[PDB]
Write a protein that binds this ligand. Structure first.
Ligand code: CLA
Ligand code: CLA
Ligand code: CLA
Ligand code: CLA
Ligand code: CLA
Ligand code: CLA
Ligand code: CLA
Ligand code: CLA
Ligand code: LHG
Ligand code: PQN
Ligand code: SF4
Ligand code: SF4
Ligand code: SF4
Lengths: 61, 41, 160, 171, 80, 739, 130
């Protein structure tokens, strides 16, 4: 995955679970949740972006 | 008349116009053929 | 006949109801003068009451012991104009409404600002979609066949 | 001039020095009441409070009870007296249980000094803490207060019944 | 006293700490995020349960979670 | 480049009409959830958060006032047009005591033509309870052409006010200094508006209403009554009815005002022909009011070395108990629109309630006292408006405290000292509310349980333990003795309610001494208790709007917020808005009890018919005195008994009242869904509904969200008020029109 | 006029502490101000600062912290909050390590940190009878 890639959220406790988002940036450092994904639908708190782990996102073909 | 027509395209104005038209043709059907309990055919 | 009911054309209580309503309207008519608009309105009321009662009598309508038309909605085509034909009419109209709404939602859902086009309707596109709903039974059973009617697993689910 | 100032020069207390909280009339009037009158044992305070309370408590029961009489009736007076005495008994029961669950002290104004001087490294709330230094704030003090309230209530109710009978008969 | 837990989804944006009305949360060094900081809850005895901390949380399902528990005069917000 | 106005501040364009939410910084970005739609209407008139300049807020408020006055003028024009075209006003003029006023006819669709009632005068329509016919008769309007011309003038005036609002927002908007001339504004509103309006109305009454109504009462038919302009051009048509116009204005300018006693009287009582106040008394009243208000308008210093400065008056009113006194109040009321709105709305609602009382107490219109539906409707409507306006004044006081209150500018003044001891105020008001409720309501419950136990001599009744309102009876005696003793130039008491003779017009009672007994004592103390509890809720909201022991920084959360959280044991509804919500509920309770008391007392002990020999028979028969002292009595002899007309209205011309009765019950019960439930359940149900929509690819882009907590409360209270008030509306109208 | 010279010029409000902050605990906030600014008390109304040492007593930690948050608007930062038990048992509370909790300071250990997201919490049925 990279910037601009489309991924499916696999985190169950997510307002965008099973949904598709756009990767903003994948951090190359040793952070726990490097993948930053932007969504079109705001969550219940109003935010439309979140940091996800490498195993919590699945790239769409 | 470019933004006025866009204002008329807003949800409230369009809903009011559509519901006014809808109530209008319903009321006029019930005026011209009143007391219709069953299908006319 | 069906359910112990009898046709309203032979229901004495139905004619009693008609006679009582007409008598009340005429008694009301007595307290006004000449061809004044109140008398014209009451006379129109009497005429409409008589026409409605006559139409209900000659309508294959079954009346109970209260002299009121009862609806036979078990499904028989004999009393098909009471429920079945209005049912078909409503199903057509409501399917039209739902189809045009869904088509508009899916059409402006692929534009740059989908949310803007929901409070400020694209009246040209809206008119284009709305008059295309007359084929909603055919369009629905042409999009379901192609798998374009139902989502599969992109739909979101709660934690459990 | 200003007649409202912070209480005892403390602007952070939830209180004010108004012409009612800290007026000379308020001071004297509250210092002549049995609850705060100096030189009274807790039994005496209870006795005076009970006397006054039974005296004014027999009134409403006798006047407006279920057995009233526009004339003087011994049955009405007896009913009012019994109702007042039973209400005093209920109040005494409340006083007794309140004192039972509130205090654990037999001699106050000392234990506070003892634990402020000789240390109080114990389960606290009996050695340390201790709210109030009055003799009414002890197990013994409150027990005698309740006893006095109860006895004085009986005596005052009887006295008020006698006075009511005399007023209704000889006037 | 209530229970406050911090989860490694913390991005160290400090919005929880500066929203706590009773000084329960604080920012401590960390190496699990870009900011190098994570929220901590070392003074939960002062936690009142108002949940302002998690109203300011930007992470998806929160990184600070408040579990209401036993009540205390501090946790009940009793000035009396 | 005028010194009072700014020229062409805002361009007249339709561009912003196509951008909803442009006023708000947060809503301008566009909707993302359905909460945006509701936030759009909740912030439309909150001009404080739309601009950071007091000048812009003031200009918006000024133009909004113009729009509101245009709406009011359009409404009045519609009323006059309906009177002119769809009314039986001409027939009612010739028979006021036997024709029911109707000014709305109903089209014959879906069988709704049954609503056209037999109002009389060869007319069919809905009976009118707004009293416009009596008002028009008091104005001297004797033809429907005059009503048409008044409607045309109302339309022209409405257009003029619309143009004024547009002009003063877009072409010449006044500056802040112009708005802050409170001395000049008070001078003008007191002299020009009030005094000159009273003077102009006195002139109209004297020259038009006095002669026309005198001719009408004399039996002259409206067709042979001269046109109103002829009473001005001809000094002989009015000098025959009032033989004092023959002297002209010479007695006025020669201080010989005694000559004008023909048409400027001081009589009191009611006109025996019409049952209303003497219109000569009304004209004299308006003249005196005009002079008093014109004099009162020359008080404040505006542009000369003459008059008062409100700042100097307030700053001099200090005291030992009040510290700095009124210092800073002038700055508060000249820099905060919310404080002015609070004061004006509270006094305006109180004025509306006072108007409602004085209306039925002293009927000011001809043939309005014998139109019981009109009297009941006017009283109930004005009391409802007063209660709503009072709650609004409390709400805007709380809003001022949250938003526009500056602690530095109010050091040790009255506002500061009130906040400093808010605990004492609220605790003592709590004790008073408990005392009043315990007493009033528990006396009611004691009466109920004594009656249920078969102990009739133990009640708080007149034939039992009696609570005579001696203070009110003393006042009643003082007023009935006033003419000749304390008002020596009066011929009759101000109102026959205080005592006197039974005034009947056409065998129908207009006014009659309202006896006060133990039943009135209990209901008056119920009124006091309900008013005190409403004041408690609203004052607790205002005083604790900024901080408390629970939330020391409640002002940082704003005026409108749902809570601070489930902590502290739970901090629901701590806002100040949530206090205007509960206060709205309690105002509904209080006003409902007030109007119930009025309806039952009037029907039972004032209204009715008078026999030719002088025997008075009332609508219900005096059951108020003995059966209004128990809750079962209120349930049975008032609610159950007088609800008979509403439930039996089906098939009649009052069937609309039964339908509205049922619909208002439905709406009131509907409110309880929002009042009892919470947002989380509805959000989680919307989650499954959204799942279904996504499964069918029909999920809207604007994400559907459940109504916010504050909006849920607002919807609940609005539906509750609408349902309850509509139920009482239908009940009252059907009952008082049937009988 | 007042018990101590460092008290803010407050006229006293019936919203201050009660019998609780005489036998359970009381909170004191101290700060130094350059100007005698007029500020709003967390309990009642308006008080006046001292051009120097200022000391205020409250019944809750939240009240002291609300006052401190208000002080930040006056560019006052050195405010410090203490807890006083029934006797003179003073404990510094708010600037616990001298640095505000919003700024990271070395020497702080994470308290209440779980090395997983919310979804990793154990099922309640496995946490029965412990
Ligand atoms: C918007 C829906 C709608 C529709 C489809 C119609 C349709 C019709 N109207 Mg109509 N009408 C409507 C709304 C509507 N009306 C409204 C809102 C009003 C004002 C209340 C009227 C007032 C009106 C009048 C006054 C008349 C019609 C008449 C008519 C008929 C001939 C034109 C036709 C059936 C005419 C007719 O058929 O009467 C003989 C006629 O005279 N309409
Ligand atoms: C939701 C349930 C429901 C149902 C099934 C009906 C059904 C009916 N109502 Mg009814 N009604 C309802 C709720 C309902 N109503 C409510 C809630 C109210 C209170 C406001 C009323 C008030 C009401 C009145 C006052 C009247 C009716 C009447 C009628 C009848 C005539 C319908 C009509 O105009 O057809 C004709 C119109 C259409 C079929 C419209 C569709 C035409 C389109 C344009 C066709 C185009 C495509 C080809 C019909 C049996 C009338 C009647 O005669 O009763 C017997 C009548 O006078 N109703
Ligand atoms: C117009 C598009 C549209 C379509 C195709 C559907 C379709 C559906 N809705 Mg639905 N809904 C809509 C609009 C729509 N809804 C709107 C606007 C609302 C808000 C009031 C709801 C609220 C709603 C609820 C609360 C529920 C559904 C449910 C359902 C499902 C069962 C059918 C039903 O109960 O009808 C429900 C229909 C209504 C309650 C009335 C809808 C209001 C109007 C008629 C629709 C709006 C018309 C729109 C303005 C047209 C504009 C298009 C034009 C610009 C071209 C079905 C998937 C149910 C479900 O999940 O079952 C599986 C359910 O519980 N819907
Ligand atoms: C602002 C107050 C007000 C209110 C509440 C009403 C209310 C009403 N008017 Mg009305 N009217 C008003 C002002 C008002 N008017 C003014 C200012 C004028 C002068 C121009 C009129 C002139 C007028 C006429 C000439 C008629 C009415 C009619 C009506 C009735 C039917 C309205 C209708 O179906 O229109 C539907 C409107 C639309 C669908 C447009 C959208 C209704 C009770 C009619 C009536 O009572 O018929 C018997 C009728 O014939 N009005
Ligand atoms: C055709 C004439 C016209 C035009 C083009 C404009 C254009 C404009 N006005 Mg304006 N205005 C006008 C007449 C006009 N005005 C009049 C007559 C008044 C006096 C009432 C005002 C008072 C006014 C104020 C006070 C403000 C504007 C503002 C604005 C700007 C934004 C308007 C907007 O988005 O809200 C469009 C809103 C509507 C279409 C709603 C109409 C509301 C009506 C009056 C309610 C009537 C309903 C009735 C009571 C029934 C209820 C049920 C825009 C440049 C705003 C601005 O520039 O600030 C940013 C602003 O604050 N106007
Ligand atoms: C004698 C002079 C005079 C008169 C009669 C009025 C009358 C009024 N003012 Mg006003 N005002 C005046 C002087 C005057 N003012 C001055 C000198 C100032 C500056 C300090 C203001 C500042 C002011 C503000 C800021 C506001 C008012 C408002 C109002 C209205 C209150 C609403 C009401 O009671 O409805 C009664 C309504 C009527 C009786 C309808 C007829 C009234 C018409 C419009 C005559 C108005 C007189 C007008 C000043 C003449 C100017 C004409 C122009 C060509 C120069 C009322 C129309 C409020 C309002 O509603 O705004 C519109 C409002 O917000 N005034
Ligand atoms: C002179 C009168 C007046 C004025 C100028 C204002 C002005 C204001 N009020 Mg206010 N208010 C008033 C009277 C007034 N109010 C009264 C009498 C009450 C007591 C109920 C309140 C209670 C109140 C609260 C509780 C709040 C305000 C708020 C506000 C501000 C924003 C208003 C807004 O955007 O609403 C826009 C308009 C609407 C949202 C309309 C809503 C529709 C209403 C609720 C239903 C009406 C139904 C109607 C009767 C028809 C029903 C019939 C049915 C059959 C359909 C604004 C400064 C709010 C604020 O934030 O202030 C800063 C706020 O929180 N006011
Ligand atoms: C019938 C229902 C009902 C009743 C009885 C009350 C009663 C009361 N409300 Mg209310 N309230 C109600 C519905 C009701 N409310 C609803 C629906 C709402 C929603 C908006 C509210 C919202 C509300 C607010 C927001 C407030 C109140 C307040 C009050 C109190 C006013 C003080 C008073 O009179 O106390 C006296 C008690 C009574 C009159 C109740 C009856 C007591 C009897 C008659 C006498 C004593 C009986 C005796 C002790 C029985 C002993 C025997 C028993 C042990 C077996 C009172 C307790 C205010 C408050 O807190 O008090 C100051 C206040 O601020 N209420
Ligand atoms: C009513 C009592 C009254 O209004 O006397 C008036 C009394 C005199 O106060 P001042 O002399 O300080 O008022 C002078 C200026 O403030 C003018 O308002 O006001 C109070 O003390 C308020 C206490 C209310 C206590 C409620 C009982
Ligand atoms: C039902 C309900 C909802 C859900 C309600 C919603 C989503 C409102 C939906 C309104 C629709 C979409 C528009 C209104 C449709 C009406 C038919 C229009 C009103 C009728 C006119 C005559 C005015 C909440 O969000 C809520 C929040 C807090 C407490 C209680 C509740 C609550 O009870
Ligand atoms: S509840 Fe949330 S906000 Fe309130 S203190 Fe505990 S953590 Fe900080
Ligand atoms: S709230 Fe979540 S994100 Fe904001 S700081 Fe505390 S932990 Fe980091
Ligand atoms: S949600 Fe309802 S309950 Fe939970 S905090 Fe906000 S208000 Fe109190």
């Amino acid at each position: 995955i990279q910037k601009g890639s489309t991924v499916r959220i696999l985190r169950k406790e997510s307002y965008w679970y099973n949904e598709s988002g756009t990767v903003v940036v994948v951090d190359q450092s040793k952070v726990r949740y490097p993948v930053l994904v932007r969504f079109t639908k705001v969550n219940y708190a109003g935010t439309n972006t979140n940091n996800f782990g490498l195993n919590e996102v699945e790239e769409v073909v | 008349m470019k933004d006025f027509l866009k204002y008329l395209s807003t949800a409230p104005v369009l809903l009011t116009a559509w519901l006014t038209f809808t109530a209008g043709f319903v009321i006029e059907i019930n005026r011209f053929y009143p007391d219709a309990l069953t299908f006319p055919f | 006949d069906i359910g112990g009911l009898n046709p309203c054309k032979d229901s004495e209580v139905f004619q009693k109801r008609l006679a009582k309503t007409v008598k009340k309207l005429e008694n009301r008519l007595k307290k006004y003068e000449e061809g004044t608009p109140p008398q014209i309105a009451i006379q129109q009321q009497i005429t409409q009451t008589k026409q409605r009662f006559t139409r209900y009598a000659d309508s294959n309508l079954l009346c109970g012991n209260d002299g009121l038309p009862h609806l036979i909605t078990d499904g028989r085509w004999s009393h098909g104009s009471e429920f079945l034909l209005p049912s078909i009419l409503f199903l057509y109209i409501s399917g039209w409404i739902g189809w045009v709404g869904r088509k508009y939602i899916r059409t402006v859902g692929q534009t740059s600002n989908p949310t803007e086009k929901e409070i400020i309707i694209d009246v040209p596109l809206a008119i284009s979609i709305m008059t295309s709903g007359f084929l909603w039974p055919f369009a629905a059973w042409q999009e379901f066949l192609s798998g374009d009617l139902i989502a599969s697993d992109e739909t979101i689910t709660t934690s459990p | 001039v200003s007649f409202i100032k912070p209480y005892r020069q403390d602007p952070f207390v939830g209180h004010l020095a108004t012409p009612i909280t800290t007026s000379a009339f308020t001071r004297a009037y509250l210092k002549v009441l049995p609850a705060y009158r100096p030189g009274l044992t807790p039994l005496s305070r209870g006795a005076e409070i009970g006397f006054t309370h039974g005296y004014f408590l027999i009134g409403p029961f006798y006047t407006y009870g279920p057995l009233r009489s526009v004339e003087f009736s011994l049955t009405s007076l007896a009913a009012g007296l019994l109702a007042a005495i039973t209400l005093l008994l209920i109040l005494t029961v409340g006083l007794s249980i309140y004192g039972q669950v509130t205090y654990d002290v037999y001699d106050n104004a000392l234990i506070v000094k003892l634990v402020r001087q000789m240390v109080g490294s114990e389960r606290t709330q009996d050695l340390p803490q201790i709210k109030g230094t009055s003799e009414l704030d002890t197990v013994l003090g409150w027990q005698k207060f309740s006893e006095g309230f109860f006895s004085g209530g009986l005596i005052g109710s009887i006295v008020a019944a006698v006075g009511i009978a005399l007023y209704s008969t000889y006037l | 006293s209530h229970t406050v837990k911090i989860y490694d989804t913390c991005i160290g944006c400090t919005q929880c700490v500066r929203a706590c009305p009773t000084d329960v949360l604080e920012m401590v060094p960390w190496d699990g995020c870009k900011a190098g900081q994570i929220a901590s809850a070392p003074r939960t005895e002062d936690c009142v349960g108002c949940k302002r901390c998690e109203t300011a949380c930007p992470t998806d399902f929160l990184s600070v979670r408040v579990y209401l528990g036993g009540e205390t005069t501090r946790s009940l917000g009793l000035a009396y | 480049k005028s010194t009072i106005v700014d020229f062409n501040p805002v361009e007249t364009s339709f561009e912003k009409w196509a951008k909803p939410g442009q006023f708000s910084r947060t809503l301008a970005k566009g909707p993302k959830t359905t909460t945006w739609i509701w936030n759009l209407h909740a912030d439309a008139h909150d001009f404080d958060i739309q601009t950071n300049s007091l000048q812009e807020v003031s200009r918006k408020i000024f133009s909004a006032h113009f729009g509101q006055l245009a709406v009011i003028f359009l409404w009045l024009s519609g009323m006059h047009f309906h009177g002119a075209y769809f009314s039986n006003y001409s027939a009612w003029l010739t028979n006021p005591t036997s024709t029911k006023p109707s000014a709305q006819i109903v089209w014959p669709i879906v069988g709704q033509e049954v609503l056209n009632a037999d109002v009389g005068g060869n007319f069919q329509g809905i009976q009118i309870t707004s009293g416009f016919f009596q008002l028009w008769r008091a104005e001297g309007i004797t033809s429907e052409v005059e009503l048409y011309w008044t409607a045309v003038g109302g339309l022209v005036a409405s257009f003029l006010m619309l143009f004024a609002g547009w002009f003063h927002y877009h072409k010449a908007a006044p500056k802040l200094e112009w708005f802050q001339n409170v001395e000049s504004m008070l001078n003008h509103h007191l002299a020009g508006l009030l005094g000159l309006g009273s003077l102009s109305w006195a002139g109209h009454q004297i020259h038009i209403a006095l002669p026309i109504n005198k001719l009408l009462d004399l039996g002259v038919s409206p067709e042979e009554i001269p046109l109103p302009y002829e009473f001005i051009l001809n000094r002989d048509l009015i000098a025959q009815l009032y033989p004092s116009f023959n002297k002209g204005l010479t007695p006025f300018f020669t201080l010989n005002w005694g000559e004008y006693s023909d048409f400027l009287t001081f009589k009191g009582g009611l006109n025996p022909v019409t049952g209303g106040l003497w219109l000569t008394d009304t004209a004299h009243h308006h003249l005196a009011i005009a002079v008093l208000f014109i004099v009162a308008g020359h008080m404040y210093k505006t542009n000369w070395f003459l008059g008062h400065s409100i700042k100097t008056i307030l700053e001099a009113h200090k005291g030992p108990f009040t510290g700095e006194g009124h210092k800073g109040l002038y700055e508060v009321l000249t820099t905060s629109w919310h404080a002015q709105l609070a004061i004006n709305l509270a006094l305006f609602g109180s004025l509306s309630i006072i108007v409602a009382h004085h209306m039925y107490a002293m009927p000011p219109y001809p043939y309005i006292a014998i139109d019981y539906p009109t009297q009941l409707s006017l009283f109930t409507h004005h009391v409802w408006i007063g209660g709503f306006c009072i709650v609004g004044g409390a709400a805007h006081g709380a809003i001022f405290f949250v938003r526009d209150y500056n602690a530095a500018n109010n050091y040790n003044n009255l506002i500061d000292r009130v906040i400093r001891h808010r605990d004492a105020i609220i605790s003592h008001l709590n004790w008073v509310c408990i005392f009043l409720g315990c007493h009033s309501f528990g006396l009611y419950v004691h009466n109920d349980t004594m009656r249920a136990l078969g102990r009739s001599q133990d009640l708080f009744s007149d034939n039992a333990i009696a609570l005579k309102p001696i203070f009110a009876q003393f006042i009643q005696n003082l007023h009935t003795l006033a003419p000749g003793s304390t008002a020596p130039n009066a011929l009759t008491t101000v109102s026959y309610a205080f005592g006197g003779d039974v005034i009947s017009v056409g065998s129908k009672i207009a006014m009659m001494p309202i006896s006060l007994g133990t039943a009135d004592f209990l209901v008056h103390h119920i009124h006091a208790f309900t008013i005190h509890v409403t004041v408690l809720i609203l004052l607790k909201g205002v005083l604790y709007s900024r901080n408390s022991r629970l939330i020391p920084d409640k002002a940082n959360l704003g005026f409108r917020f749902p809570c601070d959280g489930p902590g502290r044991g739970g901090t629901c509804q701590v806002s100040a808005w949530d206090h205007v919500f509960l206060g709205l509920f309690w105002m509904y309770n209080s006003i409902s009890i007030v109007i119930f008391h009025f309806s039952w007392k009037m029907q039972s002990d004032v209204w009715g018919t008078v026999s030719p020999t002088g025997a008075v028979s009332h609508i219900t028969g005096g059951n108020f005195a003995q059966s209004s002292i128990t809750i079962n009595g209120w349930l049975r002899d008032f609610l159950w008994s007088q609800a008979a007309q509403v439930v039996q209205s089906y098939g009649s011309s009052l069937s609309a009242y039964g339908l509205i009765f049922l619909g208002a019950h439905f709406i009131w019960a509907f409110s309880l869904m929002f009042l009892f439930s919470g947002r989380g359940y509805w959000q989680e149900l919307i989650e499954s509904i959204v799942w279904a929509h996504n499964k069918l690819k029909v999920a809207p882009s604007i994400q559907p969200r459940a109504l916010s907590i504050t909006q849920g409360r607002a919807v609940g209270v609005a539906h509750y008020l609408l349902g309850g008030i509509g139920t009482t509306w239908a009940f009252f109208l059907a009952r008082i029109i049937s009988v | 006029k007042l018990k101590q010279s460092d008290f803010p010029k407050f006229e006293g409000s019936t919203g201050g502490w009660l019998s609780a902050a005489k036998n359970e605990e009381k909170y004191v906030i101290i700060w130094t101000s350059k100007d005698a600014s007029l500020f709003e008390m967390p309990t009642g109304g308006t008080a006046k600062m001292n051009a120097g040492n200022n000391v205020a007593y409250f019944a809750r930690k939240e009240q002291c912290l609300a006052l401190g948050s208000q002080l930040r608007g006056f560019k006052i930062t050195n405010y410090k909050i203490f807890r006083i038990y029934p006797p003179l048992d003073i404990t510094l509370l708010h600037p616990f390590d001298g640095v505000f909790p919003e700024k990271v300071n070395q020497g702080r250990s994470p308290v209440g940190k779980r090395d997983a997201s919310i979804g990793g919490n154990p099922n309640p049925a496995s946490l029965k009878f412990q």
